[PDB]
Design a protein around this nucleic acid. Structure first.
Ligand SMILES: Nc1ncnc2c1ncn2[C@@H]1O[C@H](COP(=O)(O)OP(=O)(O)OP(=O)(O)O)[C@@H](O)[C@H]1O
Ligand SMILES: Nc1ncnc2c1ncn2[C@@H]1O[C@H](COP(=O)(O)OP(=O)(O)O)[C@@H](O)[C@H]1O
Ligand SMILES: [Mg+2]
Ligand SMILES: [Mg+2]
Ligand SMILES: [Zn+2]
Lengths: 203, 21, 664
DNA sequence: AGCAGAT
DNA sequence: ATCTGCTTTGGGTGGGTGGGTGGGTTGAGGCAATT
């Protein structure tokens, strides 16, 4: 009963929208523009499927770009420690699976088995990638379908499957050069390509 | 916490997209 | 009156007068009443239309010489709730009674059907509750369950003994035949007559055999929690169910959860734990049908005798060939050429073996080479939903042997064996490859032989065999630089080469150009679609009616009816070219060749001359017509000529269009 | 051949 | 107290509806990931 009263008192407030934005990641200082994006990502969007089984995405992907030592990682750290389901990784993932799934087979007879990656483990959560601009070519290509169709299709020797990857990506990247150059456009300062750049809701 | 999207929200979402260009 | 021949009533059947349900069902009078009620249900049940469902299902059963009567659980639950409860809790005895009654109903229509098949097996279709292989517990033992998984291992079909007869080693007397339980062996310890502790020899003058097979079900990767190991169970498929399921396929198994004693399990665990298996009662192919889960029956691409007396009214109408094209992915605004190509590929041409010496492909391949946000992957997903057998592969998630076939060393026999890949799973189907341009070159070159010869040849580890891959390929690609450059030729805008390009019957180039009127219509349609698909926007009947009303707005033909129609056309209709204007086709082919002599243009070979005829046959098939008409050939010529012209550069496109206006 | 069981 | 009867070593003159957390272990060949 007490918590409900608190909830009602929250909605009745007229500054409520501003208060929530100012209450995200209080550790960081003076980045209200970013905080609004993170809050909107947590709430997400409505997930819809058409009358013929075509699925429309409802997850918000955010990319953050900045010079070294600008609290980029501090934003990812807050999200993983706060969001219900989340996974903190890096573009240069150590595991064999990487951001997507991979097939690994035990010694001799053992048939092939699927080893989950970052995007699979964060199902229905938020996947935070610390250095997007350093991803591997296999994952760079494989991220195309995961971000839009929300699946990972693998067809290897003896094993074929479609793996759910219904996750929202919150990435952090460094400029192609040492520092963000104000003269060039966002396209020039980033090593990403047009198909990926169109898959991010906010920058 | 509203169940109907008003144009004021559409305008707000438009602003965020512009700042990302 | 003989007490054993008296019967109770239904309400008198609901109140139980035994200590267990099995003992209640097994009683003579109760069994008689249950059999009578099941016969009444089979004879009298009527759907909304008012015509008997199971009379027609029995007539078709006899037509096909089959020995399986498919019964819907929901129908039984609505007509007789107590019988559904009994079947759910005590499936063995109830299924025995229901098989006897089903044979009696079938013999009603075909008086001498006992001479074709001795017994009829009742198959349960839609059990309301679905479990996983992790959720199975002791409470589910000896009760009907429905589970899903991936068939990871299969055995050959062995003839099993339906009745076993034993003879005493010492006395020599032969004991009467006893029913064999597939779950565990039957043994006799105390002889009725000899009363000898010694074993009795297994021998029999005459026996009847039944097919037997075992499969290892494994949790599907989609359902297993991410990163955890998958559970598995073993399923026993008795006669008429053998070979229905194949390795690497998803399935929905309805059966009986049974347990038996295993000495080795007790020895390894140290506790008296039993071994559990599932006795399959029906199988439903769940592969490539994740978007058809809202559908009744064990097959969702099959037809009644009334649904194909109307697939033949829909098809005499005059514009079916274009209401079919409209009904392709209606949630996508435009792209009429893409939808036409997809429909042609779905219906496909007719394969032909001339004199038994010449083999000609009879399936159509499509390539979508467009700009980023132009609804290509959505079209591929729709084609996956609609096709009878489809497999989806992505650029770098596929390997050379993942497609086609691979060679492994069997863990059991430790001998080399052959596994089927994507193209084998797509036999008589569609293989949808997304991100086609990002594939590895080695993986991309693997499908060359399968795309034309419809076969895979493997020479590895002492195996020299040729398979069958009668599959069509619909591939989506992204031009070099991420955006099509209309000023350059097609060859410069893609990295593919002549041999691979020449195998694609239809090339559809998609461009995203900012036209304010075009942007206006597309945005309006997209926003209206998002409004339509919003989740918030009898109970089952009302839900179906509202879904039908929502669907009617954008698709002239229902999607399920369309799936059944496509399957029927691909199965039963083989159009043949009899009357055709040879000069027209020859003259268009020569024109195409001469105009394609230009450097960098889309390749033209005899393959495309044959593609014209394939597309004409597909159009004839769309109408369920047994002969290819002149209009179909004209439409196919138009399709090919347009697809050729669109790929040209801006500078020469106007001249090419003017030159080819005769045929379009 | 040593040990496990039925008359 | 006597008579009747099964099974080893370990190995293919028991097997693959017993498996490889019950031991029999190098050699070759195919596949994914790593390059
Ligand atoms: N605006 C800020 N508000 C609060 N702390 C900040 C801010 N900018 C930097 N810091 C402090 O800088 C410290 C180091 O920065 P940090 O490494 O987290 O930044 P980064 O942008 O993720 O780095 P890099 O780009 O090198 O990965 C952080 O612990 C944080 O305390
Ligand atoms: N002509 C169109 N009609 C309807 N939706 C479209 C159309 N073009 C693009 N879309 C939208 O784009 C999204 C799918 O993009 P997608 O086809 O996956 O990109 P790609 O072509 O790179 O695969 C869908 O949500 C869909 O609604
Ligand atoms: Mg950092
Ligand atoms: Mg795509
Ligand atoms: Zn005897």
């Amino acid at each position: 009963s007490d918590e409900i009263n608190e909830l009602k008192e929250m909605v009745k407030d007229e500054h409520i929208y501003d208060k929530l934005v100012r209450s995200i990641a209080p550790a960081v200082f003076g980045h209200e523009a970013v905080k609004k994006g993170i809050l909107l990502q947590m709430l997400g969007g409505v997930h819809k499927s058409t009358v013929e089984g075509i699925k429309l995405r409802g997850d918000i992907n955010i990319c953050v770009v900045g010079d070294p030592s600008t609290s980029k990682s501090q934003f990812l750290k807050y999200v993983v420690g706060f969001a219900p389901r989340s996974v903190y990784t890096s573009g240069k993932a150590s595991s064999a699976a990487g951001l997507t799934a991979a097939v690994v087979r035990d010694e001799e007879g053992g048939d092939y088995t699927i080893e989950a990656g970052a995007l699979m483990l964060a199902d229905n959560g938020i996947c935070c990638i610390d250095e997007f601009d350093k991803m591997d070519i296999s994952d760079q290509v494989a991220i195309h379908e995961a971000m839009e169709q929300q699946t990972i299709s693998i067809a290897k020797a003896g094993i074929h499957a479609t793996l759910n990857a219904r996750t929202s990506i919150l990435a952090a990247a460094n400029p192609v050069g040492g520092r963000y150059n104000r003269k060039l456009s966002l396209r020039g300062n980033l090593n990403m390509t047009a198909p990926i750049m169109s898959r991010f809701d906010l920058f | 916490c509203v169940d109907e999207i008003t144009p004021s929200f559409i305008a707000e979402a438009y602003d965020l997209l512009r700042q990302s260009i | 009156i003989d007490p054993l021949r008296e019967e109770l009533t239904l309400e008198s059947l609901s109140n139980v007068k035994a200590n267990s349900y099995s003992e209640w069902i097994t009683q003579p009078n109760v069994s008689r009443t249950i059999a009578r009620e099941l016969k009444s249900f089979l004879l009298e049940y009527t759907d909304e239309t008012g015509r008997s469902v199971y009379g027609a299902r029995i007539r078709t059963l006899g037509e096909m010489n089959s020995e399986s009567l498919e019964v819907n659980y929901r129908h039984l639950a609505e007509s007789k709730a107590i019988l559904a409860l009994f079947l759910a809790k005590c499936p063995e005895e109830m299924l025995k009674i229901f098989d006897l009654v089903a044979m009696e109903a079938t013999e009603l229509h075909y008086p001498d059907y006992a001479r074709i098949h001795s017994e009829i097996h009742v198959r349960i279709s839609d059990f309301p509750t679905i479990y996983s292989l992790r959720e199975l517990r002791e409470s589910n033992l000896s009760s009907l369950v429905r589970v899903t998984g991936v068939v990871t291992r299969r055995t050959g079909v062995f003839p099993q003994l339906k009745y076993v007869k034993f003879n005493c080693l010492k006395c020599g007397s032969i004991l009467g035949p006893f029913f064999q339980d597939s779950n565990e062996e039957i043994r006799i310890s105390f002889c009725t007559n000899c009363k000898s502790k010694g074993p009795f020899r297994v021998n029999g003058e005459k026996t009847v055999y039944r097919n037997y097979q075992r499969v290892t079900l494994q949790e599907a990767p989609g359902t297993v929690p991410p990163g955890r190991l998958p559970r598995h169970r073993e399923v026993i498929l008795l006669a008429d169910l053998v070979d229905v399921s194949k390795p690497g396929e998803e399935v929905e198994v309805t059966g009986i959860y049974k347990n038996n004693y295993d000495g080795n399990l007790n020895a390894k665990n140290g506790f008296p734990v039993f071994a559990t298996i599932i006795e399959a009662n029906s199988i439903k192919r769940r592969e490539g049908n994740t978007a058809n889960e809202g559908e009744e029956g064990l097959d969702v691409f099959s037809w009644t005798e009334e649904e194909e007396r109307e697939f033949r009214k829909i098809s005499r109408d005059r514009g079916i060939i274009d209401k079919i094209i409209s009904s392709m992915a209606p949630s996508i605004y435009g792209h009429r050429d893409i939808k036409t190509a997809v429909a042609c590929s779905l219906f496909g041409g007719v394969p032909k073996n001339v004199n038994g010496k010449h083999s000609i492909r009879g399936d159509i391949n499509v390539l979508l080479l467009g700009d980023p946000g132009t609804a290509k992957s959505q079209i591929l997903k729709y084609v996956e939903k609609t096709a009878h057998r489809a497999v989806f592969a992505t650029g770098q998630g596929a390997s050379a042997v993942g497609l086609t076939a691979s060679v492994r060393k069997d863990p059991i026999t430790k001998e080399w064996t052959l596994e089927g890949g994507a193209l084998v799973l797509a036999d008589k189907g569609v293989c949808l490859i997304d991100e086609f341009d990002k594939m590895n070159d080695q993986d991309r070159t693997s499908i060359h032989e399968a795309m034309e010869q419809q076969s895979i040849s493997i020479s590895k580890a002492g195996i020299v065999t040729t398979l069958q891959a009668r599959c069509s390929i619909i591939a989506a690609a992204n031009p070099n630089g991420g955006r099509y450059n209309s000023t350059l030729p097609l060859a410069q805008n893609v990295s593919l080469t002549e041999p691979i390009l020449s195998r694609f019957d239809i090339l559809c180039v998609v461009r995203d150009l900012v036209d304010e009127e075009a942007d206006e219509r597309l945005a309006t349609f997209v926003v209206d679609s998002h409004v339509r698909s919003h989740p918030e926007n009898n109970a089952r009947q009302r839900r179906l009616q509202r879904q039908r009303k929502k669907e009617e707005e954008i698709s002239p033909i229902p999607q399920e009816l369309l799936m059944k129609y496509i399957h029927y056309a691909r199965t039963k209709i083989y159009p043949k070219l009899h009357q055709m204007d040879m000069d027209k086709v020859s003259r268009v082919y020569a024109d195409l060749r001469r105009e394609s002599i230009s450097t960098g243009s889309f390749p033209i070979t005899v393959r495309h001359l044959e593609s014209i005829l394939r597309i004409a046959e597909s159009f004839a098939k769309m109408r369920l017509s047994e002969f290819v008409s002149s209009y179909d050939l004209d439409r196919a010529i138009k399709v090919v000529v347009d697809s050729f012209v669109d790929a040209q550069k801006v500078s020469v496109r106007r001249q090419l269009r003017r030159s080819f206006a005769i045929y379009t």
